[PDB]
Design a protein around this ligand. Sequence first.
Ligand SMILES: Cc1ncc(COP(=O)(O)O)c(CNC(C)C(=O)O)c1O
Ligand SMILES: Cc1ncc(COP(=O)(O)O)c(CNC(C)C(=O)O)c1O
Ligand SMILES: N[C@@H](CSS)C(=O)O
Ligand SMILES: [K+]
Ligand SMILES: [K+]
Lengths: 381, 381
Amino acid sequence: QFPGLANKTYFNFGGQGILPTVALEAITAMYGYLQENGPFSIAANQHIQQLIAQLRQALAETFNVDPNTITITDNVTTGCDIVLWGLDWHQGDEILLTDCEHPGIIAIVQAIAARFGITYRFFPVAATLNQGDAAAVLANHLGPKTRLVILSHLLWNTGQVLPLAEIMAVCRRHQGNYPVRVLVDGAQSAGSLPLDFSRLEVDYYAFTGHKWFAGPAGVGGLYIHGDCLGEINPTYVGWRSITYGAKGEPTGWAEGGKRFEVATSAYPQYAGLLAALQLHQRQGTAEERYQAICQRSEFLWRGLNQLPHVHCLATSAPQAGLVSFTVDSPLGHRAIVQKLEEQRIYLRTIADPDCIRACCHYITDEEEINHLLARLADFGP
Amino acid sequence: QFPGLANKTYFNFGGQGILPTVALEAITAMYGYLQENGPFSIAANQHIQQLIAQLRQALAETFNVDPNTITITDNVTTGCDIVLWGLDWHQGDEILLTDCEHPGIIAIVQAIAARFGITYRFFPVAATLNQGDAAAVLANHLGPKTRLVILSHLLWNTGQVLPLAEIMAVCRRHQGNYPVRVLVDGAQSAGSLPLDFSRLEVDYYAFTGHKWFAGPAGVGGLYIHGDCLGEINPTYVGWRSITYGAKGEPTGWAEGGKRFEVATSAYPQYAGLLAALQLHQRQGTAEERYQAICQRSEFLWRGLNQLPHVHCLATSAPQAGLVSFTVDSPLGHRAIVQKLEEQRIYLRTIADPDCIRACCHYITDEEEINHLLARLADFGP
Ligand SMILES: Cc1ncc(COP(=O)(O)O)c(CNC(C)C(=O)O)c1O
Ligand SMILES: Cc1ncc(COP(=O)(O)O)c(CNC(C)C(=O)O)c1O
Ligand SMILES: N[C@@H](CSS)C(=O)O
Ligand SMILES: [K+]
Ligand SMILES: [K+]
């Protein structure tokens, strides 16, 4: 089902997943449908609307929520932009972000701070991978003007799964000028951790389809709890965002998540993500896949512990499929990742902390892990 | 090269262009390159950046401008959203729009009005298709508080080519509170009218590749004159928008137009637009192509004039490839467009004014036009 795995040793799912054959077939079939029946026509436009609704529904079912809470986007970042630019910020309002957030997300925050006169402070979570409590660190940083906390459910740099439920309680127990809300960056978590937003109570959860879900680059989504929808004003909008009047004029915002969708998008790619989502559910439940992912990451982590010059950041088994580690060598992590790539072994360098990250998916196997171990064994001080 | 033309009679280029074989080949080849070399790796990431640079450069050459003025987007609307949300609006600032702008664009202006307390009015341009002066109408509406004028270079509803140069001069000569700037919606003009931003001076020009340029749905762009760049603050941003420091931290904005680019997009589609652009230039100059488009639209227009129950909105030959008309019939224009599609003849209904629109491209032939005319003749009072 995943042809790209065969002639390589891939551990970069968190960067982009290997596209399954059913996804490529769906993409290709959609271009064909458009060429045959349109591309612009009553038939083609109806087929596109039906496709969009099917993908919105598939995502909704994935997270066990109502389709109205789902916005389709192009990537994780756009979901964060929609939430951050849509909040009715006031001068002096404060945003707290962990010290492990993506530089792109930090950039939106700086842009917001410049535009609305809000302020932002980081709180340290990287150091809580093996000890401490990230929820308690947050409690020690909440203030009177704190309105939004931004965190990645699964940290892209260290592989820690933040204690989201406990963190939500902490924010909800806080008595301040604002009911503290939390925007979750789910780039690594969605598609690997079992996520059920009925059971787990969240405010805003941004994700993408091109990483753990193994969809094509260019399609992602955003979840907004039904009760937080009214707090998010549309910013980037267009013809997909509105309801229409008698003369084709705008009369209001489209229902639910649609108000945040803009204009023409890569429709064939939506069919690709839908097909990939369906393939995963056929393999087993999110829970079974998650256990399989952990089985592989612990196997890799154990092997790495056995190599004398490799040092895993985590001192206990990985909580998900990310395994970060350093290598004692005169070379530097960037050179080591390049040398591994020359051997068709694919990992990624992490800037902070300075280390190397491997991603194990449920489709990763022991021979791949053992091959990675074999090649790393050669680096030394 | 344009396979989709066979077995249908297509006049919806303005909605979406028929994708050329070279474009589909380039899209498929890109998925293949990503499967073979990544999809996330040093090699794959470099190849994607190179592809992005090639597309930006090709767009730059298309309009005779420096690549630094080009932003890659997903559609026409996004370009307008970048310009509109990026300007530093103050209560009472005014935006003037023609009375023929797209509903999605009007909706952005409305969201802006609500958030910054700006105001907007329409100047009547529709009525200038056959008489009057749109530039003069603009002059009589220009005021001390007008900060920006939004207009479609080629009107999507009536097919009028607005006097952009004159209208630009009108705006330059004005003496008001703000130096008056003009944002152009080039959904219909780009790819049909010969456009040179070195010989034609514009401030902002939003376009897409999926209409007259015949690229895939999902890739477009925005031109911002260098003198206007600083006035546009990045709004939706992400990892593609910034430069990086030593610990991978944001250190400023990416070069030129890159700062308004967000995050992961459908890269294979970029290869598709690049290929469609290169084909579009393989077939004569923009002028030769524009003359061909007009030879086709005048032939349809003339033909429609001969049909007793059809009435073209334009009383002189169309200035571009759009030919709008009404039909005298109890059926209504939507039923007629549906019936035409039942015969694999593809046109579209326009909501204001109530009419039908046909798009003639340089690849449209007289047999297709004669076919549409034979079937249209069947309707009557
Ligand atoms: C926490 C997190 N947020 C946001 C993103 C940006 O992805 P989009 O392009 O979908 O907005 C990533 C991607 N990470 C990568 C690439 C990685 O860690 O290898 C991420 O890990
Ligand atoms: C003037 C104008 N502006 C903006 C758009 C929206 O395009 P994007 O999806 O690329 O933002 C269109 C679309 N027209 C159509 C569909 C038509 O003429 O049939 C348009 O004609
Ligand atoms: N290439 C950078 C972009 S920051 S989202 C990275 O993925 O680390
Ligand atoms: K070790
Ligand atoms: K007539």
